[model samples]
Target chain A: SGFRKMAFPSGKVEGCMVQVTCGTTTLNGLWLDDVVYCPRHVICTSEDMLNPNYEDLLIRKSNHNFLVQAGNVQLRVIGHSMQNCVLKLKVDTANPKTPKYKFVRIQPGQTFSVLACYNGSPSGVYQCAMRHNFTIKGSFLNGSCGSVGFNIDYDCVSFCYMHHMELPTGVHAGTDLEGNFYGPFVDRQTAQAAGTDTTITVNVLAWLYAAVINGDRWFLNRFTTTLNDFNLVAMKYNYEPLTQDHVDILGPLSAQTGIAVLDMCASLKELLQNGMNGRTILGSALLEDEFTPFDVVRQC
Target chain B: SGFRKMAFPSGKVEGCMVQVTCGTTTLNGLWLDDVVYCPRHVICTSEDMLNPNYEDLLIRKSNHNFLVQAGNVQLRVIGHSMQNCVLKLKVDTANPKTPKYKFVRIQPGQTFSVLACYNGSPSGVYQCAMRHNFTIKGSFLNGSCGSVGFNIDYDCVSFCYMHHMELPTGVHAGTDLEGNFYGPFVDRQTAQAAGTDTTITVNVLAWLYAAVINGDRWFLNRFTTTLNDFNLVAMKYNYEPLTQDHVDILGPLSAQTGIAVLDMCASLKELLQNGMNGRTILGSALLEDEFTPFDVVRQC
Candidate 1:
């Protein structure tokens, strides 16, 4: 994955809220804080933990296994290559002075039963920041380096809202070489404004939805190539490359993203209105907090 | 480089050959067979070699050094970050039965007296294929594996024909990171047709022209991001990500290709007529064997 995020020029991060689901089905009710889908952990019963069942959902997007903290909190996520997937979670329950933060490696097929205590306690918003997980390299044919990564951190938008997880505010969230959201917005908007370039937001939504709903590699990879080509055209003219056309198994991006977006949003009109209102609530409110970034549909 | 060729589907290898150039000048008269362009060898004259006056052109694309054989034969290419680049050439012209190919590291600012015997000789199309000179690794963030490589061989269309050099027919050629090729396509027909789409071709041409003629990282990388966004759009829909909007500095792709194309074609109208006749020559004839795959500019 020598690909880097060229969509946003550098350090202009945009934040958006995404909910995890499986083919139009939101996996929100399974978390401890059923109202907000906390990605830090997935609420699991003793029997469910003993005999966890996420193969069906995980099999859809990638080889992944997310963690479950207490009754609802889920973090320490798992995926195709979690060996490098590390995150820092700081829980400052009673005292900000003594707030302790620890780094944990989200191993494959693993969870964090240790942090389930703060699933929905609302102990002053747990802050989790992650560096770009993937390495940056140049193209094999050209030996050119790329800067596409998930250099993002998770933000607890609300302790009592439907959407609980989100990327940093105003940061442009782009995809990895494989079309996965390593994190939140990788860049910001100095030249192109939010509405001026719907491509980034569209890509963010499209990728998240595809992972949770579509989970089709053909769609993902095809979309990757398509975006690459779109950037190709933009590069030819020295123009900004972050407008739109950024998703599915790789067809007309508008269509694939259309469905993914529709599946992701309970109301497309409100989502569009959010953009109209300069993304005030941003892309929040549609998904449940139980719908963490790595949300999976586990059988209840 | 963890980049792979996903722009084009397998089994569909369209044919579009292009030649290297310095702005509007072709680096053709310097190769062997007047057909196949052995980039490793560039013909240099005593007058041109002594003073070595390609700075005007080389400075734009990259800091490069080329080797000159006996007469007008030259190679031993160098430029960019060539310190790490190594090439090997072995000529065995005595016997086809005893044909042997050896590897010689093409050192930066170096020459190839070691393999200059058949520098300009038509030794039954001296074949040259490269492998992934560098290790394929994932993004530093992900630390996964990649397949980006300069593992390409040379191919000559015709000596007397207008079309010339090209990549493996039909392989959608986009930059993994930043390998000269700028971004995606602009024209719909000649774009990705080889791969059941012409947008890829358009992007390929747009990228090369931008690097050679326009030469700007800001322009190049920006375009890369733009194409990525465009692809994002296509991924949204089950749509082909090929077609228009892919280029340099980010201007009207039609304009970017329009100018570079003007400089490339011996004529523009004839090239278009070729399409009217359903690409009779198949994007061949305008530029040289150096410019094939829908050579548009034709003689007025």
Candidate 2:
């Protein structure tokens, strides 16, 4: 509806040579010098015919190929004969207060890049937004005073901090080549038998230490879930153990092994100390803390 | 040390055929019915000469190819004529109190898989160890009465829990193909300019919402680090803002946008509500919460 029209001066001569250019196209005709020209009385009337589409006029450019940075959106104008035009940008048409850049002069070959959101003020006001779809309106200053509208498709993304750990060298805690998570036992039966049998077992503890050392976050996650499940199931069953048997078994073994029988408190203390030293080997601090403490009576 | 020896009876007169099989090797000799026997009778004396190395005697089998599960270490015995021989296992020689399996009957060609450690008693005691290098000693009740020791090289691992979050479908918050983390602004200059400029921007807020929705842990991590850095730097400089300008600019914009200017409390409430509804569009809950609350005066 908003189209540019060409009209002649009221008191001009009867016939005269006249030339006009609309966007990139130019036309020449003899003017009657009246309100209208003799050649094709209608003059570049349709805005669509004269002005290129917004997509054709503006080229989207970004530092990243797939994603635009959080606030930055770049648009390069390519409209023919659109130089010296005033450009107005509106981020959200529904929200008048969203963000507006008014009266920005446009050069056909020039690129206009701007942040799409308000990050924050010096006064500690942070108002950053990510993705967006906006519009840019351009009005020519010299020619037929043609005005065009551009709808831009743009979005932004932001980065945040997360907790991550680094594993020791030569330690792997994630998965095997087949995508199976690494663990201590081969199967459920093995795990159950190992846990239930009267053998000096520390495979679970060893795996945990490896995970911690290797910073295997994924393995740790699976391990924790399994442990929780086991604990919950055990709790539901109201499981109990034979205390005397553990003492009978571990007491003599403790004397032979030189590893003192400890309670939970002592075990935790030893674990923390060994953890500090990073000496988490079997029968070492980790072993001592893991075994001996549970089932056996407290010896300090 | 610990070698078998053969002796003759005193009343024996002439030589008699005597045959003996030691492990997989066999020897035939003539006993003179005397103190010494013919056919170079020196009995299988050395334990090493008769017994195979632990690795050769026991074949390691696990459910996993690359890693063994916690506590479970499978060994298939391949000794010749080792049946009915008592086998004792010691996990940690250094720690006598470490888990041990005593008097386990050995059967050749049989698989003996056991947990390497004492997981815990039914008494809710959790003692799990990971890795180990131990020995399985075997004794024969018949045939030369020779005993052998199998020094086993085995270890175990345990699983533990860790924190992880699954991103929502179709949302990517990690990195692009080039391993570059996604962010709101392209460069530091752009970020700084965006933050300092007067244009109403919400790229940061939008990016954060996307991360939360996508469960983009990595992106969230980066965003948090950047925000903290910006805050720390701003605090160090004792930066201040012109409060009146914010009010004049945001006040009019707020009225036109239909997004009510709110205080921190009101903004948080709105954000929580919108977050619950999963409506995190621009000028929606996240935008209002992020933008209007900080610099502008309170208008709940």
Candidate 3:
């Protein structure tokens, strides 16, 4: 199995910012260096996966950063132009009355991520949902968490708003918050990384965003039977992100792009045009070996 | 036709800004007046239409008083809001190379219109799409005209633009440059009914604007004939003006609101919490009408 014995830092090229993972015979022997949490891929080498997705990953820096002092967590929209966007978060999904908010503006044409840090509690599984017109497109990560509570874990599926954040007094502790990833990243990761000597290495894993609906649409509607179909299997075999189980499990198959039963939505994990290639703001697919048009998008 | 003629200055000391037709015979003979242009309803009255749909009959002015300049037209956007809303006019649809723009900003919760003129020629139709993400909706009008054209015995649609003000000096024998309602009204009516002031009342008989399509997307799906077995009727009526097309049509039938497509959308339209009511800057189907559950939003 090409799944064991991982690396933390692939190579130290003078200045390799935070952490880089090196691989001896990791996902594939041909693959050399990758992020510790990079996804798995077959056709490509890990070395080839070491490049960033876009010119600069648009990240929510200061103004556009969604920081809720009232609550212990913060959320920042990540992706392309996410500053002018709005998000509706559900801190407690199973039964959330109202989540929280963090509205800000960001730059355009940049790929960035939301950075949230709470002085109080800043460690927990964070989930989020983003909206454009009066519609729910999709979300970043939406599910219940055990940490954002005192007596009982609210375990709310965050449409937006962080469910919890509990950790030591440090940075990696504060991950995602509500509205942080509502729109898109507010800044260009390239610019940020350039000035700060920070490097973001994008490892093309296998995963896309799509939805599974039983159908309540007018005219032709039906119930979903065999949802976990072959396309998924194909996707997994091609490239499975060792870290991104969320995308693999929930994201749509590459074939299912504008399939609206799922609606034109994006998670805190975002979008613009989710073409067959599963586009990124950086104008590329998350997975290197994405599907082509000749292949049919999976059916309901 | 519930349309009837009414006088300008009523018996009461205060005169009516917008006239009302006499045929307003609802359940209480007040329904027509109540909702002439009921935004919640599918059809509407011209304030002068006696068959008001039973909404804001007594209040609200449908007929506006605007002055036309030599080379200008007054375009008004009817709604009570000033922000987050947009009236972005991209005049030329065909020529993407050179597109013209005119932005109209109405005061928040204010009834205002933009006074713009079509100095040049507009080959395609001029359209105005309005929306304020779900609060105070519409009751507005769009554009005005320049002048008339002259041609043969009218076999084909011919267009002639007015260039100079210098009255065709030696054309007195030739239908006198300004004659009857066929050409631009160079002269005013002898006078109005005493109390009635001055109004050129140019009968161009040419409608200026048009709504493109229903922007309000409660929900959507590519109508698949196999699954959707809708009641195919002779005349599939849609509530375009938000007047009382549904109510008028519903009057003959005993179907409840939920059974109809408009009602189904109304249900979702109503589902939007009373979050952005009266805020005009926001928008609504239930802005002023708390009684009706649905608010006919523009393109929610």
Candidate 4:
């Protein structure tokens, strides 16, 4: 239409991206006309391949996607004045790498509102980070990419005794911008780590079950099989989860890993003891050439 | 210069009352090779505009001929952040009302400066305004035009206190946006109540200072009529200055206007303080029907 123009300022880039619903709700198609970026790339999927480090979270008062009353929102820091600053949203998954996402800008004191639907995800993690150019006595600034300091990243501490995922840049392993780790790029990280049986970085301390006196070995599983996939069994019997209600999305990893871990353990009963008599068995038992992960609900 | 082929961004109205220096600096003549505004016009000249007002100041701020240092140079507001604002400067002295002078935009946080020295007086009032989108916390803004909180229009205030001039804006003297006084278009407001007769406003604050302060006193007459022609009075006296000494190949506006204000007042010491109550007198006390201001200066 004669080089049609629209007033919508596309985010830092084009092609708006949104966190898609998993499984049945795959990312259909994103329309720029709908969601404008909070800062510049509200619609774009990830950080520019050129600048991977910029994929960061915005923070405010230590909370991500901070929960407000769900209406027009205004924040005022009377004592602090900011210059050349920006307000952004942050995402924190268990993995350290940031996903390409959008950020919105907020005026220092002027009032801006949070529309109802704009609160698409209240789960928290993605919050606000205000970057300042200079900070003075009354007002100056500082370089700062922020995040809402809450449990934004997925922390399945209860399910997996340890979890580790290494992701590289300019790659997408999820469905949209949400954390959906599939294969290809996901395989690269796992394969590299698997090659050397690197140490898993996830840990669930008894502090999580601090409420339970001796319920230390809450969920324990010991399985041994090179027979294709035995996670189906681990899934069915996943460490008798405290809450049978909460599904272990990582049930497959947990089950598959638990089986491998069990190959060296004489008994699953030794899973708990205030310390790691078992952690020593991780690399040898869990990620050996004999083990491979298979997706499964809980125990079959 | 082959017509200078200026690019007037797509959205701007092609010609209707072109605000030459009102948007971004791109259109302000910075792109082209040569210089734009002249430096001579930077300092104030009280002689040419003995009774100037707000409109005069606005034109002065937009003169583009002199470099403007937003805070330290022009007006200083200790704390306040200014954002999303449009600062326009123009170069239309000799034929101000003709609209040929181009406009220049002031970049955010960058100082808007002058393009050239002023040559002739503006035949009519030129225009300029700063609409601040918002303010920063713990910071303030001060300038020539109106402002929000504690902001003081040093240009207007200083001009009012120094010379024998009048307020320009037609609406309540310095309130309306329309080209102010120096014409049938005159509206005024008083900064104070009259001691005896005559109402006061920014208009009287400038032109009719004697009229409002002393009620048609003798000093008012000669001050506006004589001595001001030299116009260098402000630079000489530096009524209000940014530095102890505005040393330059050219000095500050105060240095420019100081000389003119003094020359206009040289012979009227007694009349200036109000007639005898008279302690001193000037040498040329020639009395006549019209009342020579020189005589008033002569007869303390």
Instruction: Chain A only: list TM-scores of all candidates.
Output: 0.19, 0.15, 0.16, 0.19
Q: Residue by residue across A15-59, what tens digits does model 3's lDDT show?
A: 101111122311101100211111111112344445533223223
Candidate 1 local lDDT, A105-213, one digit each (tens): 3311111111011122110011111212211111111101111112112211111111212222222222222223333322221233222211223333433443333
Candidate lDDT scores, in order, read 0.23, 0.21, 0.19, 0.19
Candidate 2 local lDDT, A1-300, one digit each (tens):
000010111111111223323234332212121211111111223454434343333234211211111113222212211111111111111221122212222211111211110111000001111111111111111111111111111211111100011122111111111212222312111111111212122212322332232222222221122323333433333322223443454444345444333322133223333332423232122222112222122111
Model 4 lDDT per residue over A258-287, tens place: 422323222232333232332323111121
Clashes of 1: 166
lDDT of 1 by residue, B1-300 (tens): 111111110000011111233332333211221222222112223345333433332333432333323233233333232111111222211111111222223211111110001222210001111112211111111111011211111221111111111222312221221122212321112323222222123323433343333222211221122344544544443323433332332244346444433232212222332322212121121111111121111100
Which numbered prediction scores highest in lDDT against the true structure?
1
CA shift of B155, model 1, Å = 27
What docking class should model 1 receive? Answer: incorrect
The reply for model 4, stretches above 4 Å from the true place, is A1-300, B1-32, B38-41, B46-48, B51-167, B170-300
* C-alpha DockQ of every model: 0.05, 0.01, 0.01, 0.00
Tell me the spans in candidate 2 whose CA falls farther than 4 Å from its real position. A1-300, B1-249, B258-268, B283-300
lDDT of 3 by residue, B1-300 (tens): 000000111101000011112233210000011111111111134453343433343234232321111113222312221111101111111221111221122211111111111222111111111112111111111111221121111122112111111122101000111111212322122221112111100100000000001122233222322102221211132112232443343321213212343333333233232322322111122212111111111111
What is the lDDT ranking, best to worst?
1, 2, 4, 3
Candidate 1, which segments miss by more than 4 Å at Cα?
A: A1-300, B1-39, B42-300
Please rank every candidate by DockQ, starting with the best: 1, 3, 2, 4
Error of 2 at A277 (Å): 36
